[model samples]
Target: MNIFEMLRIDEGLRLKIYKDTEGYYTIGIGHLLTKSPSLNAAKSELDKAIGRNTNGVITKDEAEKLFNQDVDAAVRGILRNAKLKPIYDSLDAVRRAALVNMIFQIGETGAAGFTNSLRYLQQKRWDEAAVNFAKSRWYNQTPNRAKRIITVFRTGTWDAYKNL
Candidate 1:
C-alpha cells in the first residue's frame, strides 16, 4: 500500500478538531492545529486551510487536501535529513513507509531522537531496530500505532495491520 493509505489507517480520519494524546489541538487525520509558536497563528492557519471560519469543523475534501500536503511535508522532512536520507534510501518500500509514519506522527525532530533505532534500521538489524523503537516515549504514548509500525520494522511487511 501507499504511504497515504498507511497513514489513513494509522492516523484515522477526523474532520473535527480534537485533543490529541498530548492535549494539543489536532485535526484532519493527525495534523497538529496547535503546532505553531502561538495558538493564534495556528488558528489563523487552520482557518485559511479550511477556507471559511470553521467552528472547529472541516469537510472530508478539505481534510483530504490537508492530509496530502501534510504527508508530502512529512516525507520531505524525513528525506531532507542528511543522516536520515541514506538510511531511508537503503530501506525497502514498506519499511520506508513505517519510517515515514513515525516522522508523520512525531515530526522530524522527534524521530531524530531515536539515534540507536535509526542506526539499527540502517544496518538492517530489523529485530534490534524494533526493540530500540519500543524503548521510547513514543511507544508509551501511542501503543497500538507504535506496535503496528514497530511490527513493520521488524518484519518488513504489513503483518500488524492484517488483523486491523
Candidate 2:
C-alpha cells in the first residue's frame, strides 16, 4: 500500500488530507471527502502539531502551531541542515521507510542528528549503518521497533518489518 493507503483514510477514518491549512480535503471511509475553509484552518493547526518543515520558508508561528515546542525546534533544526535529504534518498525502499518511521518517532533532527549513522548511510556503508543504528539512543528506548527496522534496512527485506 502507498503512504495514503497506510494512513487508513479508506477505513472510515476521519482523516483530513491537505497540503496547506487553507485547503483541507476530508475523506471518510466510503463517502466522497469534502473540503471546507474551517476544516482547512483546523488542519493547519494539526499540521503545526505534526512538525512539518517544508523548508526555512515557513514562519516560526506556523511551525509552532504544527508541533509541540520541543518537536518544532527539532524539526526546524533538521530543515536548517542541508545534508540529510541526500542520505535519506540514497536508501532502498525498505531502508528509506524504516528511516522515515524512525524519524517520525524520533523527530527529524534527533534521527538525522546521528552523525555517524548519517555518514554511514551516505557513504553506502550498509554494515556500518546497521551497527550505528543499533548504537543509537532509539535502540534501547524502542528495542523491538529499532531492531526490526534496522534488520530490514540492513537486509533489504521489507517483510522484516511489514509482517509486524
Candidate 3:
C-alpha cells in the first residue's frame, strides 16, 4: 500500500475534534490544533478546511485534504534537513515510508536527533536501526505503533502494519 493509505490506517480518521493520547486537542488524522501559533489561527484553519464555522466536526473530504497536507509536510521536513535528506534518499520506498511515519509522529528535529539510528539506516544495518528505535522513549511511549514501524526498518517490509 501507499504511504497515504498506510498512514490513514495508522492514524485513523476522525471527523470530530478529540483529545489525543497526550490530551492535546486534535482533529482530522491527528492534526494537533494545539500546535497552531494561536487559538485563532487554529480555529481559522479548521473553519476554512471544513468550509464553515464548525461545532468541532469535519467532513471526510476536509479531513483527507488535511491528512494529505500533513504527509506532504512531513516529507518536506525530511527532505529539507541536511542531516536527514541523505539518509532519507538512501532508503527504499518502504523504509522511506517508515521515516516519514516517524517524522509525522515526532517532528523533523526529533527524528534527526537519532544520530546513531540514522547512521545504521544509511548503512542498511537493519538490525542496528531497529535496535536503536526499540531503545527510544518513542518506543516506550507508543510500542504498538513504534514496533510496527521498527518492523519496517528491521525487515524492509510493512507486514506488521499493512493489515491495519
Candidate 4:
C-alpha cells in the first residue's frame, strides 16, 4: 500500500493534512486539549511539551523543528534497515503504511533495538519474530500503537511489517 493510503485520515486520530506556503502537503497530530488544527500548530504544542519535560533545555520551538526533520529521517531509516526491507517488499499497501507509521513514531534506533525480533526477521523465523516483537519494549511502551503490528507479526502474513 502507498504511504497516503496507510495514513487514511480518520476522525479517531487527531491528524491534520494541509499544504504549506510552498504548497507542500504536510500532516500533523491535533491535540485534544490545546486543539491545534495544523502541523505547524501541533508542532508548536509538541515542542512546548518537550521543553517542559526537558526542563527548558529543549524548547518546544526546537522540538518542533527537530521532530519535523526527525520524522523524515525515521521513515527513511525504517526503509533502509536491512532486516525490514524484505518484509516491507512483500506486504500489501495498507499494512506497509501502518508499519511505516509505527516506525515514524518509534524511531529507527528503538525499532532496531529489538534484537530478538530483528534476529527473527533476519532468519525468517516468523513465529519467533512475532513473539519477540510483541514482547519488545517498543510494544510495551506503546501498546496501542503496537497492537496491529503485533497482530501481523504473529500471523506470518505477507502484509505484516510491510510499512517501511
Candidate 4 local lDDT, 1-164, one digit each (tens)? 34433333211122344443224333343112133445555445544654443321333444344445544565677678886766566655544555566575554655666766756655667677777788766677657557656665555443532453
Which regions of candidate 2 fall more than 4 Å away from where they truly are?
Answer: 1-81
- Each prediction's TM-score versus the true structure: 0.92, 0.52, 0.90, 0.48
Order by TM-score, highest first? 1, 3, 2, 4
Candidate 1 has a TM-score of: 0.92
Candidate 2 residue lDDT tens string, 18-88 = 32222334322211123445654545544454456232133444433333433334334544557666766
Model 3, 46-155: lDDT tens per residue? Answer: 78666789867888888888888999999997888988999999999999998898898888767756889989999999998899878888888889889998998889
* Predicted candidate 2, C-alpha RMSD: 11.7
Worst 10 residues of 1 by lDDT: 35-44
Off by over 4 Å in 3: 35-45, 48-51
Determine which window of 10 residues in candidate 3 has minimal summed lDDT: 35-44
lDDT, candidate 1, 1-164, per-residue tens: 77888888987888877767777778888888875455666667689877888767888989999999998898888778987888899999999999888898888789778989999999999998888899999999899889999999999988787656
| TM-score: the better of candidates 2 and 4 | 2
